[PDB]
From Swiss-Prot, chain C:
Locations listed in the record: Sarcoplasmic reticulum membrane
Highest taxon of the lineage: Eukaryota
Signal peptide (residue range): none
Ranges for domain EF-hand: 151-179
Protein name as annotated: Ryanodine receptor 1
Similarity comment: Belongs to the ryanodine receptor (TC 1.A.3.1) family. RYR1 subfamily.
Protein encoded by which gene: RYR1
Range within the parent protein: 3925 to 4166 of 5037
This protein's domain notes: The calcium release channel activity resides in the C-terminal region while the remaining part of the protein constitutes the 'foot' structure spanning the junctional gap between the sarcoplasmic reticulum (SR) and the T-tubule. Pore opening is mediated via the cytoplasmic calcium-binding domains that mediate a small rotation of the channel-forming transmembrane regions that then leads to channel opening.
Length: 207, 49, 242, 46, 34
């Protein structure tokens, strides 16, 4: 009924309203792109590169000594390092920008090393519904701010099509958990396995 | 042309002092990071010329 | 709002070695109000008013004592490094007395296997890392006063004033091998050098025996009262042997 | 001309005797980037 | 899908497989399959 450290989670935005998310390529095209999952009945959405786990949730005063020199459930006003599941590297803000408008906004990417000057994200509530210090209920509208560049990660619209950016403009998001503490040696969704019985292959036109 | 001129000088004198850059205090070189990001350097050359 | 306030004050002083004067007095003001709010919390509960007993239990007290238990296992293991922090440590421990004496009265008068006692134990297993540190701290300074009275230390004192050198005391506690590996050098930093020839185990055995007495008393009253109320539980059996 | 009767006052708020104070210089630049309309319409996209 | 098919046009009605143990007329999950 809450969020939880070491949970595979997935970002979701909604803006011509649809259901969008954040997948990353990894090992080439480190700039993050966006994908829609509003149309599951006729087409599968490739969500297997869209899952993020949670590693650290600690207060915005606690990490300064960490930059100087296991289940902690998370609250608002904390700071979060979240990593990519498949490509194994961490999400981060960046320095350059491909905005091509001088719109004073960086663009997110991915980073290998966790030397956390810039790969930390802080949490914020939406309105006067909830407030600072309360816990994070499942399925909530959040606002994510970088610690370093102090921008909001927002959905860009006016530049033709739509993609993510990092500017001063509020944008709600979501958590929508897809996994938890699994059991010993069972099967769950999203995994990869074999199909013995001497197996079930496909060929090296290969249909 | 006096409003934008008197906007910059407070952004000028809110830049941190140089002896707080020899010490790498994370605010004093991230305040400079945001303040360098807002107005580019080449646009400053166009005004002074 | 007090808990994450003063824990934010701990992270600011996590780095440097000593605490100066103005930082000390601002921390004494910080808990003398927290002693009052605990004393006023337990008087809503002191008479067995079950209308308040199962109302605090559904509130947010449980993460409140968890954050308080996090600073308690780190302050006393940092304030035990200097002889001019002791009067603050003399008034930090009795605050910790005055929060478990609330925590006694929350579970009083209940049934043998109740739900309040069942949610009494999950903080102890959620904060299982840093309930050990206070439990170790009541072991190092209670095992010491039995070691320092034994006949083994008379095979190491040579000075007429009993000033055992630090190079000799390290092999001394290594000989009587009841201790562990890394703990015996933490005990070195708790003494005072005075040109390194002195540790003066007269005062060092009983400097901490006095103020840690009654706080060390009622933690035995907890782990008894949780045991003979909720028996056959594995996690509580993983506590009292420490 | 409304800003020139505001930003002159902020100029005396983060600067004394030729030295820049630091406890006030940090807190003023958090505010005026949380609301970008404090910058003019040339700073959003001219 | 009775062969493999393009992922850009694989409908739910086109392909929807389902694991059972036989064929009778028919939060975190419960731990069934091993």
């Amino acid at each position: 009924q809450f969020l939880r450290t070491d949970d595979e989670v997935v970002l979701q935005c909604s803006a011509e309203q649809l259901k969008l998310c954040l997948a990353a390529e990894g090992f080439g095209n480190r700039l993050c792109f966006l994908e829609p999952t509003s149309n599951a009945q006729n087409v599968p959405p490739d969500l297997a590169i869209c899952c993020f786990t949670l590693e650290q949730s600690l207060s915005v005063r606690a990490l300064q000594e960490m930059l100087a020199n296991g289940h902690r459930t998370l609250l608002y006003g904390h700071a979060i390092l979240l990593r990519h599941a498949h490509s194994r590297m961490y999400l981060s803000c960046l320095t350059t920008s491909r905005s091509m408008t001088d719109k004073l906004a960086f663009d997110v990417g991915l980073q290998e090393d966790a030397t956390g000057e810039a790969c930390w994200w802080t949490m914020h509530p939406a309105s006067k519904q909830r407030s600072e210090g309360e816990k994070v209920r499942v399925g909530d509208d959040l606002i994510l701010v970088s610690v370093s560049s102090e921008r909001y990660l927002h959905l860009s619209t006016a530049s033709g099509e739509l993609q993510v950016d990092a500017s001063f403009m509020q944008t709600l998001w979501n958590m929508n958990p897809i996994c938890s503490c699994c059991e010993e040696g069972y099967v769950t969704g999203g995994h990869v396995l074999r199909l013995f019985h001497e197996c079930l292959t496909i060929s090296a036109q290969r249909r | 042309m006096s409003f934008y001129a008197a906007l910059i000088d407070l952004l000028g004198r809110c830049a941190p002092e140089m002896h707080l850059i020899q010490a790498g205090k994370g605010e004093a070189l991230r305040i400079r990071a945001i303040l360098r990001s807002l107005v580019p350097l080449d646009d400053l050359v166009g005004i002074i010329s | 709002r007090l808990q994450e306030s003063i824990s934010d004050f701990y992270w600011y002083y996590s780095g440097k070695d000593v605490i100066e004067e103005q930082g000390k007095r601002n921390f004494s003001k910080a808990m003398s109000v927290a002693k009052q709010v605990f004393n006023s919390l337990t008087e809503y509960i002191q008479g067995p008013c079950t209308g308040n007993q199962q109302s605090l239990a559904h509130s947010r007290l449980w993460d409140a004592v968890v954050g308080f238990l996090h600073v308690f296992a780190h302050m006393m293991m940092k304030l035990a490094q200097d002889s001019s922090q002791i009067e603050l440590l003399k008034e930090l421990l009795d605050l910790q007395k005055d929060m478990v004496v609330m925590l006694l009265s929350l579970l009083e008068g209940n049934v043998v296997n109740g739900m309040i006692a069942r949610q009494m134990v999950d903080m102890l297993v959620e904060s299982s890392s840093n309930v050990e540190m206070i439990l170790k701290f009541f072991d190092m300074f209670l095992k010491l006063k039995d070691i320092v009275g034994s006949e083994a230390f008379q095979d190491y004192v040579t000075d007429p004033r009993g000033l055992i050198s630090k190079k000799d005391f390290q092999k001394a506690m290594d000989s009587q091998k009841q201790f562990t590996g890394p703990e015996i050098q933490f005990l070195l930093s708790c003494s005072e050098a005075d040109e390194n020839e002195m540790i003066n185990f007269e005062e060092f055995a009983n400097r901490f025996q006095e103020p840690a007495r009654d706080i060390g008393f009622n933690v035995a009253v907890l782990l008894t009262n949780l045991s003979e109320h909720v028996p056959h539980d594995p996690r509580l059996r993983n506590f009292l042997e420490l | 001309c409304g800003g020139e009767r505001y930003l002159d006052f902020l100029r005396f708020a983060v600067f004394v005797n030729g030295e820049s104070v630091e406890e006030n210089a940090n807190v003023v630049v958090r505010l005026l980037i949380r609301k970008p309309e404090c910058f003019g319409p040339a700073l959003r996209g001219s | 899908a009775l062969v493999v098919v393009d992922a850009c046009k694989a409908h739910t009605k086109a392909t929807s497989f389902c694991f059972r143990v036989s064929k009778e007329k028919l939060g975190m999950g419960p731990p069934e399959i091993k």
